Amino acid sequence: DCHLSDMLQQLHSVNASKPSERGLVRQEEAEDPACIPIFWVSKWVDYSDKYGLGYQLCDNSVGVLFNDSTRLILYNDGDSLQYIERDGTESYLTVSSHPNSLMKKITLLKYFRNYMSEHLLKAGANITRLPYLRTWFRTRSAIILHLSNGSVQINFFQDHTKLILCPLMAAVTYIDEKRDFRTYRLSLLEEYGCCKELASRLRYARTMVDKLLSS
Ligand SMILES: BrCc1cccc(I)c1
């Protein structure tokens, strides 16, 4: 299930602790720079009506999850392609070899790429195995992006705040409206507590994860 069940248990545990009602709250003590993620989605474009969901990762790789449930990834060299078939099977190719098979999907990818480069800003830009987008969906309040490495990223439209959950290290990275970035160990938030804002979004995340699991 790509670590979602493990993520749900982590989120329930911290939310069950009611971290915003400790009294003596010390969020900073829950920080850990060893849990900082390597990968997250830095840009995205939703054209699901026609083609699919295009996105850029923080390494500047680009990808598309097409509506036929296939996925094409362009590495940051601008030429190397990874193609993920419906059945999970993966193959590697190049743009320069001009393959008849994927010419249309490559062309589409470049259109996504060009849009993001011209019109979108890169999230997480202020800081330092390539996963692909397994699935995504959006609510009125956010878009939920589940990567093949188990990470779940949640972008809230209203305030441009973001969550990146990593179940492997039982950690959450929180990006606030000031574009400020902090990574926390979930078990420690349980102990030292946190602000109402972070707590509310972890509750929202629990629910979004259940949705992913319900599909
Ligand atoms: Br039909 C041009 C096109 C195709 C895919 C994505 C985008 I943004 C634009």
UniProtKB/Swiss-Prot annotation:
Positions carrying Phosphoserine: S5, S80
Domain (POLO box): residue spans on this chain: 40-118, 132-214
Result of altering L57A: No effect on centrosomal localization, nor on S-phase progression. Loss of centrosomal localization and of S-phase progression
Gene Ontology molecular function, alphabetical: anaphase-promoting complex binding; ATP binding; identical protein binding; magnesium ion binding; microtubule binding; protein kinase activity; protein kinase binding; protein serine kinase activity
SS bond list: none
Region (Important for interaction with phosphorylated proteins): 160-162
Superkingdom classification of source: Eukaryota
GO annotations of cellular component type: centriolar satellite; centriole; centrosome; chromatin; cytoplasm; cytosol; kinetochore; microtubule cytoskeleton
Residues modified as Phosphothreonine: T128
Subcellular location(s) of the protein: Nucleus; Chromosome, Centromere, Kinetochore; Cytoplasm, Cytoskeleton, Microtubule organizing center, Centrosome; Cytoplasm, Cytoskeleton, Spindle
Tissue-wise expression: Placenta and colon.
The entry's keywords: Acetylation, ATP-binding, Cell cycle, Cell division, Centromere, Chromosome, Cytoplasm, Cytoskeleton, Isopeptide bond, Kinase, Kinetochore, Mitosis, Nucleotide-binding, Nucleus, Phosphoprotein, Repeat, Serine/threonine-protein kinase, Transferase, Ubl conjugation
One GO term (biological process): G2/M transition of mitotic cell cycle
PTM comment, free text: Ubiquitinated by the anaphase promoting complex/cyclosome (APC/C) in anaphase and following DNA damage, leading to its degradation by the proteasome. Ubiquitination is mediated via its interaction with FZR1/CDH1. Ubiquitination and subsequent degradation prevents entry into mitosis and is essential to maintain an efficient G2 DNA damage checkpoint.
Expression induction: By growth-stimulating agents.
Disease tied to this protein: Defects in PLK1 are associated with some cancers, such as gastric, thyroid or B-cell lymphomas. Expression is cancer increased in tumor tissues with a poor prognosis, suggesting a role in malignant transformations and carcinogenesis.
Record text about domains: The POLO box domains act as phosphopeptide-binding module that recognizes and binds serine-[phosphothreonine/phosphoserine]-(proline/X) motifs. PLK1 recognizes and binds docking proteins that are already phosphorylated on these motifs, and then phosphorylates them. PLK1 can also create its own docking sites by mediating phosphorylation of serine-[phosphothreonine/phosphoserine]-(proline/X) motifs subsequently recognized by the POLO box domains.
Family: Belongs to the protein kinase superfamily. Ser/Thr protein kinase family. CDC5/Polo subfamily.
Subunit and interaction comment: Interacts with CEP170. Interacts with EVI5. Interacts with FAM29A. Interacts with SLX4/BTBD12. Interacts with TTDN1. Interacts (via POLO-box domain) with the phosphorylated form of BUB1, CDC25C and CENPU. Interacts with KIF2A. Interacts with CYLD. Part of an astrin (SPAG5)-kinastrin (SKAP) complex containing KNSTRN, SPAG5, PLK1, DYNLL1 and SGO2. Interacts with BIRC6/bruce. Interacts with CDK1-phosphorylated FRY; this interaction occurs in mitotic cells, but not in interphase cells. FRY interaction facilitates AURKA-mediated PLK1 phosphorylation.
Task performed by this protein: Serine/threonine-protein kinase that performs several important functions throughout M phase of the cell cycle, including the regulation of centrosome maturation and spindle assembly, the removal of cohesins from chromosome arms, the inactivation of anaphase-promoting complex/cyclosome (APC/C) inhibitors, and the regulation of mitotic exit and cytokinesis. Polo-like kinase proteins act by binding and phosphorylating proteins that are already phosphorylated on a specific motif recognized by the POLO box domains.
Protein's name according to its UniProt entry: Serine/threonine-protein kinase PLK1
Organism of this sequence: Homo sapiens
Gene name, Swiss-Prot/TrEMBL: PLK1
Residues of the full protein shown: 371 to 593 of 603
